[PDB]
Amino acid sequence: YSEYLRGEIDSLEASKIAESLNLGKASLSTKVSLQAVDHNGESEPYSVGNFTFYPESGLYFLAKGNADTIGQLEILMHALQYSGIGGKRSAGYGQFRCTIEDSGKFDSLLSQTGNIAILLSSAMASDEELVDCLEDARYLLKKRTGFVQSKTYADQLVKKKDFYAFSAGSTFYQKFNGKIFDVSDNGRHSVYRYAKAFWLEGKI
Amino acid sequence: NFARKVVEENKRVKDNRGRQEIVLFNGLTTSKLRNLLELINHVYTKVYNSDDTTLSEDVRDELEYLKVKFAYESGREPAVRTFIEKTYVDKLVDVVLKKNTKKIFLDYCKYFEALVAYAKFYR
Amino acid sequence: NFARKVVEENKRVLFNGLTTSKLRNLLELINHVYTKVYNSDDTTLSEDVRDELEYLKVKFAYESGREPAVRTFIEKTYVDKLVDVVLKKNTKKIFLDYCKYFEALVAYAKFYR
Amino acid sequence: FKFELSNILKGARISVIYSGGDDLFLIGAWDDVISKALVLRKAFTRFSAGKLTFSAGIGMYPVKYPISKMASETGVLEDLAKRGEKNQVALWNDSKVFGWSQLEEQILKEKMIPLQEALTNSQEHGKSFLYKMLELLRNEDQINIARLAYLLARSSLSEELTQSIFAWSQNKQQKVELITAIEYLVYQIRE
Amino acid sequence: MYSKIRIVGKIDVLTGLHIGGGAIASPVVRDPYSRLPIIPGSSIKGKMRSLLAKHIGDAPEILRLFGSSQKGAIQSSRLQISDAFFSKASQEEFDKKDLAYTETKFENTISRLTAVANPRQIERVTRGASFDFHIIYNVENINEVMADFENIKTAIHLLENDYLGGGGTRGNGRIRFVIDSIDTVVGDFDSSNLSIK
Amino acid sequence: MYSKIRIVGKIDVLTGLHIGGSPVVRDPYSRLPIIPGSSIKGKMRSLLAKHIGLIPGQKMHNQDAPEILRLFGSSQKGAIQSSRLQISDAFFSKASQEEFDKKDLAYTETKFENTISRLTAVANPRQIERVTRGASFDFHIIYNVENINEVMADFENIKTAIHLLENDYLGGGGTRGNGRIRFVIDSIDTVVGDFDSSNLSIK
Amino acid sequence: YSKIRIVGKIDVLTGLHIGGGSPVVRDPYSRLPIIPGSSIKGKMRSLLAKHIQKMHNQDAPEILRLFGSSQKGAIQSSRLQISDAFFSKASQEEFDLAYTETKFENTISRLTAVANPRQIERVTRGASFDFHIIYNVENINEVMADFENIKTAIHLLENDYLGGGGTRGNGRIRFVIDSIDTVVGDF
RNA sequence: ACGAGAACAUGCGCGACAUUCCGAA
């Protein structure tokens, strides 16, 4: 990482890094719906795009907070192992097992000071911080969309308000503290969109 | 099986008038042994048809006739007598009679077939 | 492999005039004993399987005596000595390896025809 | 790009989604697509006097397949072809990244044509026998090489062709070409 | 409070199982990485839902079990049935005996007019194979756990007397369930008395 | 209240059975000869369609009589009828395996035939693999009770099919003496549901 | 569509010989000699065709109607199904005398008059095989005629041999029909 | 409050049709 920030990674080295990732294989499973057949109809095929990880690959992330928050996140992650993350969790996807530990390898980088800040999460600041945090910035706006997954938000399923967030990897010379925005449109409950900023300082 | 050594001992080579005949004994003709071979063939086909775990009394009577034929063939030619002496077929038919079982008779028939097969192969 | 080498060496007519009709009896006996071993789940060959392998050896000798092409096949391919080796080691893996060797032998012999 | 592609693709079941800059997007019949990709490579070699090379990705998808998935997977194949010498064509998956001359000659003009001509005589066109060849080729066992030799013996086709197929399966970087030719022939004779 | 029961076990292939999904004639669905036969969780979920709908007869219980997207009565799916992967013990057993994981079945179709047999090749999972299946039951309500589990027992019985994929009226897809364990992984609910099959 | 009726029993071979896969179909796991359920279902459906009546100029199996479509299933668009009969693969029974292990049978045989030309009188030889006569197979059938009032009648049809199958073959060339079989039903019980199947019988 | 069953006996008048791959054809289960249904069907078809081509599927229309035809575009189902004739249990008890006997033929050459002896295994005379035949009524009107043809074939098979070398005294048989009943249908 | 929720890659389909282990002594 640091070598990349100092500019000591060549184009061939960048290609080697890109091809050295061994996450897994993305495939598209074709399924069918036979519910209309019993009503004098036809089968309705559809597609689910899945991604299977290699045996020693997976997805990690970093959590920051006090002891109570860390413990509550331990319980939440323990339940999330069996709830699943992603799409068709009830149709056989997203099941995982998680381990929570300390990260010295990452505490070496998170204690580093520098002249630039790098976003580690999809974040956005309020207006007051956005006034002064956008100078000399190099970012990427992502359109966060989707439907509200809730059994009590409304009668039928509806979408939430369109959101725009800075991408992970965006570099700012001012570190802005994001927040948890509301993308609910007059629903029973407030739908939350987390856009707080986890920062990694570095030298360019 | 252990018939390999018996057939090896029983195997000889004949030469005459520039012709080399690889035959175990001078009188060990395929038909002379084949008479008793076909008697045993009838015996074991009857055993196969009966499909009984014990040696039948009628098979025992044909077998006694087989022993009579063994003595007959020993008298007929000294070569067959020496072959029977080397192989001790009489002891095997005796055990087949005594323990009175299909498996023992099948093992003895397989051993005798092994003897004749090794004799043919060494020819 | 070894089967390829021996079949190529005996190729000119293979194994002094060997055909599948000559071998069919030995093939049937071998695959019968192979299926009997396959049904059982044991690392060691059972007693009846050992007796059947002895019968297979004597059938090899009988077929060598009957035909010259079969005789030279047996002599060049070491099949009888391999049967003796399988009997001595008494391991199912060795028997399966011998069966695979025989099958490869037959396959190559058919291939060069 | 904007004028000569229409002339090159003449008489083919192909629609040009875009052609400009240095990129090109074509959608048509799969066999027409591969044939016209080879023709385009030859015409581009002729146009640039050999000073410019292009890489390509060719995907084969059913009708009603998601168009976004089509584009993304073909772009993944193209980016796979843009590695190292980056003068290659990816074919239907990541394991079939060939050269242009390797695909035109060593796969189609050398392996697929003789096998197609031999198997046209077969009553069933050789679909089942090609399936058995694919099954035997996918595995990597020496005894399975013996099974392949037996199958070639029982194929009832030209002996020199059986020897050629056995040699091709023996050699690596020629077994992949053999598998690609077998799959192309299987796709050609199907419903 | 909130509970989740983990039901792990094995699906044993009684007769060759074909779930549709190089060039293979009617190939089975496979794991993209290991290229191992799998039983998609959607297949099991749909088959059990159809069997339970036939038994009861959507009905409310089906909506509690397999979830509903119906307007107004949005029901969460209590059953999360994961994909059944080729068992490791079955993998070792098939590596021994030199047995492939999948077999090719040849079938005919005799025409009703010309009496001409059209051949057809399919692929099945060999009868000796076993699949590790994993199911999570979510206790959104504690009072219906017994009813939900008796419905699951009925569905499992019907499935064991039915097929799982492909054309099972022609002797395909027969399977058996062996329940290795039923243990509450989340919450305080006591699943010791609960049982399936 | 769904009902499934389980009919288990034995198919006893009477003349050498050859279902091609000239080898026969074998279960890959046990390497024993097998009777695919597709073969049994197709033969039963064909015999029942011929006996009940075949529409002239018929081209598809979906044009069979309504009883045949009710029993063995129909796939016509709109009128999709689910098959009530599910015929499973008949596996080589363990009792027959024990009986064949005694006397040392190989579960199978090779039968030698030849074809004699009308003019040249040349007998071209051939070999076909068959299942030995003494062999037996475990047959398992599941009947789906969808309509109560049509259960008994449906079973009658099944009985007729069996009565046609016992007088017919099952696979290979049975006009030349192959595939002749007999059905002996061990039990007919309602495996699923509250249906009363005590009076039902198919032989 | 009615299935009519013809069940009866084939009693050999001479040495019955079917050359199973000189051994004779035997059922592996019972180790008794059998007469394959393919042999009987082929003999009757050949005799009836002679009484009434390269492809062997042309024949005469009655032959294809009775014994079946694989003609391209004219595939005709076989109304005659000839099953394997198994050794009768009554004949087996009568023999219980080996079921099969070996016959020796010197086979002397012409020019050199050198004998080349051979052994052929043939079922002893007086042995009986229970035979079973199925006739399917595809058309009600033709059945009579079909049976007439069948009778003719049977007559020919009684005047001819069955398997082995019949010009030297092998395969001669006799047919004793026990019953002809409509097992399936209302015919 | 996971571009999410519900959705069986499934229904129909005989590896089958014609074939003397025969001529010769």
Ligand SMILES: [Mg+2]
């Ligand atoms: Mg570009």
